[PDB]
């Protein structure tokens, strides 16, 4: 459908009212089914209209115009629905031509810490609602963890690189509003072992299938067996994978044992039979001579001498029958024994070479979560799974910076302004910053509200880069402590000519040791110009930041030579190496669900702080200190769309507070 597909593109159920809607429309959701379908249609339709043309403001009037009866009947209902959507940033978000120019008379003052996507998204929304907004940014540029390298025609993202599908992604709307060159990623990714030899197709498929089965096993181990605590400590995903692997090694051994144990049971049947056949051959030999002697008494003989010949003859054909029946039973136990020797169980679970290739699939998982698997919560690492977008993953050939730079237009942004202290009281806030260039030049910003978009890395920093006065409550600081903030670096290799398969976007390099599985484990070509991006993931990321760009480009060229040959790999024209853990305006790459945390901490990070009263016995103050950023959005963490959506959320929560709902 069109109306139902607009609900889906807005991450809303088309046929049901959300918790947020129930809060703003209690009269409707608590009332009769008919009115709700009217609500749901008006909502779904308003969204459809915005999405069909997101380059110009959708006004209340424009909405009512294009609504057919009986849905245009109730004009207040349509006005409530339109206002809700506009406020919560489901319509008229991003960069659109405004119909009615914004009124010169501004209500309320907000300081936004950081001009990353979360910051910029919020700032636009608040200005749209007619608040006075100022962003304080420590860097000499906007975008934050969206960082794009540019020298001549060379263009390469050191931060966010990938749109993780357009199906329900609000970056779909932004891509129409801003010229981004979105290019699909071809899923074909050949591996190449330590030497330079592509993994054999049969083996590649075999390890990849084992990896998925190993993961699926950790989930079963987590949910069905409830193996989520061990020694009064939360179970890591790494721990669960070790334990699942060990149990697979145990089963390989247990299998061999049961197989050999049934070979000895057969060899001991055979021994018992051969012993019986040897003793019977002796009794046949002994009894044959007896008959030979008795029959060598030539006739004529009395009847006792005749009987002796006959009785011994009978007795000997009997024992010769038994031995022939036993020699049959011998033959079938020798067939059975030759079959068990022919069909042995597996010698080993995984060879040294298989374990190295499996370690690449673990590196890939350590890249995705930007952290060693030993840090990830087994139970909750994938807690955002149900909200993933549909459609092909794409890259920005333009460079992702095109997006923030666009969002920054028309906004009061103080660059080279490092927030040092955030003061919040019953009567308002003071934000104290300094010039990054000369730390002595001090600035004081007075505001009704502060929106903090400081990365979780910065919030974690001990001792603190930013002082809160009064200090943040235990419930907030405990969440900051618990939550994971990961690391993941990129090496940009700019060449003069393409020496790689230009229809292959990805290709892996398998590390020799487990300890270095992350080290330059993957290479991207996604750009018009000849550029390769090497990821440094897992435990490698932290360690490789203490090693110089020359040595890193060194290890890079080596690995590429091994695959393409010394004659094909030139010196690079330009090289850049990200060091995100050392970057003091990031202190890492993005959030992960650490062992001992859950999605619930993402919600704690998003809860605003309400100061105490100035004079005692004074009424409960309004909230002053708000939080946005990828670490604040439980359902879309560690993404640009997550940051974007977190900004829009806080802009609505602040407007509701300071302009009324």
């Amino acid at each position: 459908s069109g109306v139902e597909g607009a609900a889906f593109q807005s991450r809303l159920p088309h046929d049901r009212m959300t918790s947020q809607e129930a809060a703003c429309f209690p009269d409707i959701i608590s009332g009769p089914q008919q009115t709700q379908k009217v609500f749901l249609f008006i909502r779904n339709r308003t969204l459809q209209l915005w999405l069909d043309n997101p380059k110009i403001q959708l006004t209340f009037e424009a909405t009512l115009q294009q609504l057919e009866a009986p849905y245009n009947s109730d004009t207040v209902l349509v006005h409530r629905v339109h206002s809700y959507l506009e406020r919560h940033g489901l319509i008229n978000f991003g960069i659109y031509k405004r119909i009615k120019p914004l009124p010169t008379k501004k209500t309320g003052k907000v300081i936004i810490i950081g001009s990353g996507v979360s910051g910029l998204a919020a700032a636009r929304q608040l200005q749209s609602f007619g608040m006075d907004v100022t962003l304080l940014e420590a860097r000499d540029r906007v975008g934050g963890r969206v960082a794009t390298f540019r020298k001549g025609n060379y263009v390469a993202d050191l931060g966010a690189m990938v749109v993780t599908g357009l199906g329900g992604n609000p970056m779909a709307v932004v891509s129409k509003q801003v010229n981004m060159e979105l290019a699909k990623i071809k899923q074909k990714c050949p591996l190449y072992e330590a030497n330079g030899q592509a993994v054999p197709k049969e083996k590649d498929e075999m390890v990849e299938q084992e990896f998925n089965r190993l993961l699926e096993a950790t989930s079963y181990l987590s949910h069905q067996l409830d193996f989520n605590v061990l020694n009064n400590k939360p179970v890591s995903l790494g721990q669960a994978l070790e334990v699942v692997i060990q149990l697979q090694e145990k089963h390989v051994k247990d299998e061999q044992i049961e197989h050999w144990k049934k070979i000895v049971k057969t060899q001991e049947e055979l021994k018992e039979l051969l012993n019986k056949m040897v003793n019977l051959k002796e009794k046949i030999k002994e009894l044959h001579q007896q008959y030979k002697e008795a029959s060598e008494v030539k006739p004529p003989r009395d009847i006792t001498a005749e009987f002796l010949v006959k009785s011994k003859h009978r007795d000997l054909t009997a024992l010769c029958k038994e031995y022939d029946e036993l020699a049959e039973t011998q033959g079938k136990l020798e067939e059975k024994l030759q079959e068990l020797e022919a069909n042995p169980p597996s010698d080993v679970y995984l060879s040294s070479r298989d374990r190295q290739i499996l370690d690449w699939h673990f590196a890939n998982l350590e890249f995705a979560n930007a952290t060693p698997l030993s840090t990830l919560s087994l139970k909750h690492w994938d807690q955002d799974d149900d909200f993933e977008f549909t459609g092909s993953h794409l890259t920005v050939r333009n460079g992702y910076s095109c997006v923030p730079v666009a969002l920054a237009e028309g906004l009061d942004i103080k660059l080279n302004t490092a927030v040092r202290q955030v003061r919040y009281t019953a009567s308002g806030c003071e934000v104290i910053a300094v010039n990054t260039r000369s730390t002595s030049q001090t600035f004081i910003y007075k505001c009704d509200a502060v929106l903090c978009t400081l990365p979780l890395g910065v919030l974690k920093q001990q001792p603190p880069a930013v002082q809160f006065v009064p200090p943040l409550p235990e419930w907030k600081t405990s969440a900051v402590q618990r939550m994971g903030f990961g690391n993941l670096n990129k090496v940009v290799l700019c060449f003069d000519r393409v020496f790689w398969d230009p229809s292959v976007n990805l290709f892996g390099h398998v590390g020799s040791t487990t300890a270095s599985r992350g080290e330059l484990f993957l290479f991207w070509n996604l750009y018009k110009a000849p550029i390769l991006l090497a990821l440094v993931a897992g435990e490698a990321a932290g360690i490789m930041e203490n090693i110089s760009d020359d040595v890193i480009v060194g290890r890079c060229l080596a690995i590429l030579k091994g695959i393409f040959g010394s004659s094909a790999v030139p010196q690079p024209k330009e090289t850049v190496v990200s060091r995100w853990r050392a970057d003091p305006w990031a202190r890492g790459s993005y959030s992960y669900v650490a062992a001992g945390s859950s999605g619930n901490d993402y919600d704690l990070m998003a809860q605003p702080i309400t100061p105490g009263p100035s004079i005692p016995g004074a009424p409960q103050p309004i909230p002053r200190l708000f939080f946005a950023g990828e670490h604040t959005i439980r359902n879309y963490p560690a993404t640009v769309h997550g940051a974007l959506l977190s900004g829009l959320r806080e802009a609505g929560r602040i407007a509701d507070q300071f302009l009324g709902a």
């Binding site: 890939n364 995705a368 690492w381 994938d382 993957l522």
Partner: peptide, 8 residues
């Protein structure tokens, strides 16, 4: 998170 995995 999971979303960022390659070869899915």
């Amino acid at each position: 998170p999971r979303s960022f995995l390659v070869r899915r």
